[PDB]
Design a binder for these strands. Structure first.
Ligand SMILES: [Mg+2]
Ligand SMILES: [Mg+2]
Ligand SMILES: [Mg+2]
Ligand SMILES: [Mg+2]
Ligand SMILES: [Mg+2]
Ligand SMILES: [Mg+2]
Ligand SMILES: [Mg+2]
Ligand SMILES: [Mg+2]
Ligand SMILES: [Mg+2]
Ligand SMILES: [Mg+2]
Ligand SMILES: [Mg+2]
Ligand SMILES: [Mg+2]
Ligand SMILES: [Mg+2]
Ligand SMILES: [Mg+2]
Ligand SMILES: [Mg+2]
Ligand SMILES: [Mg+2]
Ligand SMILES: [Mg+2]
Ligand SMILES: [Mg+2]
Ligand SMILES: [Mg+2]
Ligand SMILES: [Mg+2]
Ligand SMILES: [Mg+2]
Ligand SMILES: [Mg+2]
Ligand SMILES: [Mg+2]
Ligand SMILES: [Mg+2]
Ligand SMILES: [Mg+2]
Ligand SMILES: [Mg+2]
Ligand SMILES: [Mg+2]
Ligand SMILES: [Mg+2]
Ligand SMILES: [Mg+2]
Ligand SMILES: [Mg+2]
Ligand SMILES: [Mg+2]
Ligand SMILES: [Mg+2]
Ligand SMILES: [Mg+2]
Ligand SMILES: [Mg+2]
Ligand SMILES: [Mg+2]
Ligand SMILES: [Mg+2]
Ligand SMILES: [Mg+2]
Ligand SMILES: [Zn+2]
Lengths: 207, 175, 142, 38
RNA sequence: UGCUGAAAGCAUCUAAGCACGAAACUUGCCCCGAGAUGAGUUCUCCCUGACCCUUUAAGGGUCCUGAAGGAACGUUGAAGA
RNA sequence: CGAUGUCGGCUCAUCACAUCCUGGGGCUGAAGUAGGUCCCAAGGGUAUGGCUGUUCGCCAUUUAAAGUGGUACGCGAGCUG
RNA sequence: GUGAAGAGGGAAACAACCCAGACCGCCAGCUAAGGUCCCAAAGUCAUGGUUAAGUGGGAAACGAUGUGGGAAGGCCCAGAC
């Protein structure tokens, strides 16, 4: 199972070799467990985690009653992680950051930075026509989106302009560089999704 | 029909139990089992398993012949056991057994270590030869075909896991 | 005199259970479609579903003759450009084993609103245990 | 294997047999002789 | 490609049975996804008052009540036409 | 014909298998390497420039390969002309 | 001959192909072409076969111990393959 961190910022790690590593600093607080789901009660084996601390006058009464019956402090959200067979988590447990005291690669999932109503050249990496040589009102438009009269329909999944990003995307197998048990940090290498202040689900790797 | 007409003479020391359309057979070399076809009547004629078709079908005599030859091979396996031989002609092509793996060595940079199934035992006296004993003729022919399939014998030098019961033909490496 | 036309407020419905551990798929599905349209009922009308609820328990051991368990194929188009997905009988069984009977009767039944209502009255199960024993269903040799 | 559309015995050792619905010529001696009606 | 094997005493990769086999197909990896009208599952929270009427019904009207929450407004955002 | 805009280039492509590579094989007048030919297979991939209006070509130089076709010889209510 | 100048029923759809010539009304019966498991009115009708290919439900030269039927045969109970 994974952790729910908050991407603080990117920086370097130097080694004694002299190499430079692009290191992302995922802070990971003590993830509380709120509700453990098994087969006979619910339908699968999976736990529910939460982090942070919301305002008392902002958590509503369903959420607050859920957390208070769960027996933990009022968090800031909910996430749900499947349980590979061989994990029996108690409902009062608090998953620390030392879960990654043995892994080398993690898979990091987060909301990518939404870039607006990005066109085709920005979104699907099209090309352009010429900027001179006669070209008129067609410097960056899509172009031909079909055939003549057969199909007589733009085929579904045609690549067009729309909203780029602001979607859950996942990078696979980034190497963990450090686990700071004191500052509550997980230092990975690379370029995780999300901006500063995004919430990233960090899982141990599959591939 | 024609092989299905003269039935099998089961000797002493080898029990048989007709479990409906299943037949089981027991003895000194281990037991075998065969689910017979659902168009074939077998019967135990007190020293001899006689054969015929159950009618309502036109696939009678072919299936009854198969049932007779299968029970013959089952009786021969349980009372004597078959004993096949493969060999490894080439340059240093060498085998060994370790209980139930055949640690081959056939010029393959990964080691070919085939795991033999249950009712099969092996012995490699000469280190270019394998002799393996068994009760079920189908599975010992299967394991022998697996070892020959690891290195099919070429037509240029006769190397590879050549059958000791089937010689091959070798084309001349001409020019 | 305009003859009888069964009003859907006053017509009554029964509950049937069909065993399917080796019935032939086409013949079984035809008889399900006949009792589902309601043509075993003498108050029959076209525009009113006078059908009967049918629970087909053990809907994966439906036996098909021929070589159809490896040769009969099923096609459905996704909706995209290249998307013509296609699964054989045993592979459709291994994916979702009630879709076979549901596709068979969804081919035989009428089409449109009343055909989809008559199909809504047909709920099938891949096991020997249903959960509609509170309805008092009766077994039917079909 | 020559995948002819008319298989035809070419010696005495060749045997015409039927796998899978197609016809084949299988030979014991010459692997040029092996054919299949396809 | 085979192993065993008969119709066809032999033979035979096949009609009974079984094993191997590809970037192809189903999966495995990522994403959408209960408007999936077949509208699913689990958890949490909140509402525990009166009458009046005729056609008695899953009916209408009146007095008190207005919860959970949502919506609106404002300061806005690495969210955005 | 009270009109469906007709070659080529750009930009988008999508499909078929009679496959150019990659995958699996059988035969070889296959020692190895490189091959020849045939069978299964369409998941991905499939060149930059010189000259011409070109498709095509010839040429220079790479590449694992520089596929063959349809789609109004795709595509001008998208673009040169 | 039919359409043109002709409706209806069949061939899924389908001027000319098959049955057929609409004066009007009827919640009456018989029937032709074609059909009778379900969509879709009517035989999961009876009798005896043939097919294992989804042939039926697109197709040739040519090839094949697929399978059924007939008739002629040439070796064979002094021993046939
Ligand atoms: Mg933005
Ligand atoms: Mg450009
Ligand atoms: Mg202009
Ligand atoms: Mg401009
Ligand atoms: Mg156009
Ligand atoms: Mg259309
Ligand atoms: Mg095959
Ligand atoms: Mg061919
Ligand atoms: Mg054999
Ligand atoms: Mg034999
Ligand atoms: Mg297999
Ligand atoms: Mg690959
Ligand atoms: Mg694949
Ligand atoms: Mg014109
Ligand atoms: Mg006009
Ligand atoms: Mg092909
Ligand atoms: Mg070759
Ligand atoms: Mg294609
Ligand atoms: Mg495809
Ligand atoms: Mg073209
Ligand atoms: Mg053309
Ligand atoms: Mg064109
Ligand atoms: Mg022309
Ligand atoms: Mg043009
Ligand atoms: Mg246009
Ligand atoms: Mg000009
Ligand atoms: Mg007419
Ligand atoms: Mg008509
Ligand atoms: Mg027609
Ligand atoms: Mg019609
Ligand atoms: Mg008249
Ligand atoms: Mg008639
Ligand atoms: Mg209809
Ligand atoms: Mg009917
Ligand atoms: Mg009948
Ligand atoms: Mg033909
Ligand atoms: Mg003889
Ligand atoms: Zn030959």
């Amino acid at each position: 199972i994974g952790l729910v961190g908050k991407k603080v910022g990117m920086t370097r790690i130097f080694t004694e070799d002299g190499v430079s590593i692009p290191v992302t600093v995922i802070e990971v607080e003590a993830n509380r467990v709120t509700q453990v789901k098994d087969l006979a009660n619910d339908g699968y084996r999976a736990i529910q985690v939460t982090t942070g601390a919301k305002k008392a006058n902002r958590v509503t009464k369903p959420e607050a009653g859920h957390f208070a019956k769960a027996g933990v402090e009022a968090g800031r959200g909910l996430w749900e992680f499947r349980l590979a067979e061989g994990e029996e988590f108690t409902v009062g447990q608090s998953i620390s950051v030392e879960l990654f005291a043995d892994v080398k690669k993690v898979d990091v999932t987060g909301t990518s930075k939404g870039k607006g109503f990005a066109g085709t050249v920005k979104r699907w990496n099209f090309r352009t026509q010429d900027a001179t040589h006669g070209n008129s009102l067609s410097h960056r438009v899509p172009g031909s989106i079909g055939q003549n009269q057969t199909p007589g329909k733009v085929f579904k999944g045609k690549k067009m302009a729309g909203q780029m990003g602001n979607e859950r995307v996942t990078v696979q197998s980034l190497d963990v560089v450090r686990v700071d048990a004191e500052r509550n940090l997980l230092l990975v290498k690379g370029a995780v999704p999300g901006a500063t202040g995004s919430d990233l689900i960090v899982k141990p790797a599959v591939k | 029909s024609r092989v299905a007409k003269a039935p099998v003479v089961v000797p002493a020391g080898v029990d048989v139990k007709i479990n409906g359309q299943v037949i089981t057979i027991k003895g000194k070399n281990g037991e075998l089992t065969r689910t017979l076809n659902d168009a074939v009547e077998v019967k135990h004629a007190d020293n001899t398993l006689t054969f015929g078709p159950r009618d309502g079908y036109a696939d009678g005599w072919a299936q009854a012949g198969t049932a007779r030859a299968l029970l013959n091979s089952m009786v021969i396996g349980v009372t004597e056991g078959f004993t096949k031989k493969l060999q490894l002609v080439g340059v240093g092509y060498r085998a060994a057994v370790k209980g139930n793996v055949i640690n081959l060595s056939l010029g393959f940079s990964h080691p070919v270590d085939h795991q033999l199934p249950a009712g099969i035992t092996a012995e490699c006296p000469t280190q270019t030869e394998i002799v393996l004993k068994g009760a079920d003729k189908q599975v010992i022919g299967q394991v022998a075909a697996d070892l020959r399939a690891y290195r099919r014998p070429e037509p240029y030098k006769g190397k590879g896991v050549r059958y000791a019961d089937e010689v091959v033909r070798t084309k001349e490496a001409k020019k | 005199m305009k003859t009888f036309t069964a009003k859907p407020e006053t017509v009554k419905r029964d509950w049937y259970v069909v065993d399917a551990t080796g019935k032939t798929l086409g013949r079984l599905a035809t008889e399900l479609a006949r009792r589902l349209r309601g043509k075993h009922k003498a108050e029959y009308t076209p525009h009113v579903d006078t059908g009967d609820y049918i629970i087909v328990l053990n809907a994966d051991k439906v036996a098909v003759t021929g070589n159809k368990r490896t040769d009969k194929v099923y096609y459905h188009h996704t909706g995209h450009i290249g998307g013509i997905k296609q699964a054989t009988f045993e592979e459709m069984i291994a994916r979702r084993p009630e879709r076979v009977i549901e596709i068979a009767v969804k081919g035989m039944l009428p089409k449109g609103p009343l055909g989809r209502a008559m199909f809504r009255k047909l709920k099938v199960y891949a096991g020997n245990e249903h959960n509609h024993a509170a309805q008092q269903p009766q077994v039917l040799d079909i | 294997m020559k995948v002819r559309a008319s298989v035809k015995k070419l010696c005495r050792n060749c045997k015409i047999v039927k796998r899978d619905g197609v016809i084949r010529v299988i030979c014991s001696a010459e692997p040029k002789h092996k054919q299949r009606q396809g």
